[PDB]
Amino acid sequence: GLTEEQRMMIRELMDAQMKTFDTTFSHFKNFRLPGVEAAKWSQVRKDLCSLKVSLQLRGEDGSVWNYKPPADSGGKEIFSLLPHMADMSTYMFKGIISFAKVISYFRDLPIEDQISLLKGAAFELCQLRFNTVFNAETGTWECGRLSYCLEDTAGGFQQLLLEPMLKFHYMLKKLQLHEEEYVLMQAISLFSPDRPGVLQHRVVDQLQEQFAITLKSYIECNRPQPAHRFLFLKIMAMLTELRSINAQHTQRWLRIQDIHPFATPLMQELFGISLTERHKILHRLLQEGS
Amino acid sequence: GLTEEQRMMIRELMDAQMKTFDTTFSHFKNFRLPGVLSREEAAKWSQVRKDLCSLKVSLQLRGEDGSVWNYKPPADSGGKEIFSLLPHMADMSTYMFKGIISFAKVISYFRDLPIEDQISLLKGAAFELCQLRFNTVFNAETGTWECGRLSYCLEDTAGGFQQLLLEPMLKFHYMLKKLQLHEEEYVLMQAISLFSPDRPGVLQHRVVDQLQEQFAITLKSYIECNRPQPAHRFLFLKIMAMLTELRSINAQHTQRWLRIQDIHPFATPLMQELFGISLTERHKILHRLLQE
Ligand SMILES: CCC[C@H](CC)Oc1ccc(C(C)(C)C)cc1NC(=O)c1nnn(-c2cc(C)c(OC)cc2OC)c1C
Ligand SMILES: CCC[C@H](CC)Oc1ccc(C(C)(C)C)cc1NC(=O)c1nnn(-c2cc(C)c(OC)cc2OC)c1C
């Protein structure tokens, strides 16, 4: 029941995802690893402890390096894995940039809207891709050679569910979405007309509605099970929740950067509030090829 | 009791051990660690694998912050992966031996020997004195060498507490730990091993034998005077039999080490001299370390 235009839209998004999502993370290299006023600290300390994870490094030889984080006592212990997660987030975003560049509807947009759209959807597209490698039964993001396993807590599943980011990943994983529905979610999140700095509001909004219409159609043709009733509205609701979480963790990120500077050059540009001159790295990447 | 000379003999060995055995391994730094991520050569390569599967351990590096890095060894895949922890264990050995060289130099009986005999004694006893020191930090309840922040936990070979006992090196450590020796008895074992008159290259065989006999008499007298007489009636002979077994183990692992060096060169310069890879001109590093 999909139109030819809609079939073409899903083919280009699926092709772009394949060409720009390093699911095995085999090209993620040269990352930092953990080495072998007062009220602001208390808020920040709660932020980081909510997402405590152990890092696992699998080698082609079969070896495994495992990092267990220190317990939450004293200060500057919570910042152990932050530099590594900053290097990982930066790598994920460079793939997000390449994802948008392949899309024809995005490439033809003005360079300032391209910068503004990626600046506003970076975290959201990054979390959507993390969800496709998230293992809900083990609480682990399986990123090829690297694995990020959630540390146990005293409250357990119920206490972790109080963290919105963690709750987003479990709820979205339970929808059992297809690759096409994720990539259409990524497109809908990317082409948001109400992002700060967008000038072609009407052009981006038209693009967004068509991506959403194509998602609604795809679900109607391939998801006749009763478990998938209202799946389109559920997905659209999850996308609205992710936008809310992005704001929370944009301010968390800025608090944590102030107390302790952990950001890469590209992440600092994304959080800097001439667009091209302020984002020189992002402008260069958008101009480069694949 | 013991003669005052035997008492001074123990006082000097304990003083030597105190100044040269870094029990916490705090000064063991800048070591290498495993990385983040033909027809008869096939024979020699086949022997090396068997040698490296006998003693499989996982490395734990505990941090000041409370973090725990842990390395699990790869299973054999017929490649360089089998030589993953050898660069680290070559830095560990070199670090331990330099403490052994320092141990012998503080002992007065060892300094008065000819330098060529000092080199010969250190060559034959370095593996034995290193394993004797390792046993004092070996926990048999968990199969782990507790080297300060570093831990080396033996891996379960599916026949744990039975398959590991086949390897004479592991059997040596479990058996020696069961004797529950004192610090003075450990240091006397080291002296008996160091002053072995039958090591290759020794020329003052009569002098070194006399010395070994007097350390052994001190050890026997120490056990008679400082332990319940009937229960430890044969503790001295048990210790001498463990030292005899360690000499046999030494010969076996000296060959293992030389075969592995032939295929994959991992040794440090000081270790290369120790394994033969004029005595003073063939061991110039060890010679300088003794002069200083
Ligand atoms: C395995 C991924 C899933 C889990 C998530 C719970 O990972 C972690 C696990 C643990 C930790 C701790 C640091 C240990 C608390 C953090 C993280 N996670 C991040 O550190 C992150 N996740 N996304 N981002 C991010 C990415 C981009 C492009 C961006 O551009 C505006 C802004 C961003 O943050 C505002 C970022 C920076
Ligand atoms: C805390 C110690 C760890 C455990 C404890 C037994 O051991 C291993 C456990 C595992 C491994 C593997 C590498 C994983 C196979 C090796 C080793 N062990 C060595 O790599 C060693 N242990 N001692 N030596 C050594 C030292 C000296 C001065 C020497 O001078 C002639 C000759 C030597 O070997 C011929 C050496 C070279």
Side-chain angles (χ1 to χ4, degrees), chain B residues 175-177 179-228 230-233:
Chain B
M175 287 183 64
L176 188 58
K177 200 75 187 192
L179 298 187
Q180 304 196 130
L181 299 185
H182 300 163
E183 298 279 13
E184 295 79 4
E185 298 168 336
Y186 270 109
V187 89
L188 284 162
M189 294 184 72
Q190 298 178 190
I192 292 155
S193 167
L194 177 65
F195 291 92
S196 286
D198 50 352
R199 300 297 192 193
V202 61
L203 311 171
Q204 302 288 76
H205 166 98
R206 183 204 84 252
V207 182
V208 179
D209 187 12
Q210 183 70 64
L211 294 160
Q212 187 186 64
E213 185 198 359
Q214 300 312 126
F215 289 115
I217 291 164
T218 297
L219 180 57
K220 173 177 177 281
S221 308
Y222 179 90
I223 294 165
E224 302 178 52
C225 301
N226 299 116
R227 288 177 178 270
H232 307 96
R233 167 184 172 179

Side-chain angles (χ1 to χ4, degrees), chain A residues 48 51 53 85 89 93 122-123 127 130 141 165 249 270-271:
Chain A
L48 281 70
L51 316 168
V53 293
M85 297 303 315
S89 292
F93 178 56
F123 173 85
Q127 295 302 329
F130 280 152
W141 288 276
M165 177 107 69
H249 282 80
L270 258 47
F271 286 94

Side-chain angles (χ1 to χ4, degrees), chain B residues 267-280 283-290:
Chain B
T268 69
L270 181 61
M271 296 295 287
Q272 287 170 359
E273 289 189 354
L274 261 182
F275 285 88
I277 290 180
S278 176
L279 269 185
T280 80
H283 302 89
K284 287 165 177 162
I285 307 179
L286 174 58
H287 186 91
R288 195 201 49 165
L289 293 173
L290 290 160

Side-chain angles (χ1 to χ4, degrees), chain A residues 34 64-68 70, chain B residues 37 65 68-71 74:
Chain A
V64 169
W65 272 106
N66 194 288
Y67 175 82
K68 189 194 143 187
Chain B
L37 312 167
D65 53 0
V68 177
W69 275 106
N70 179 275
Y71 176 83

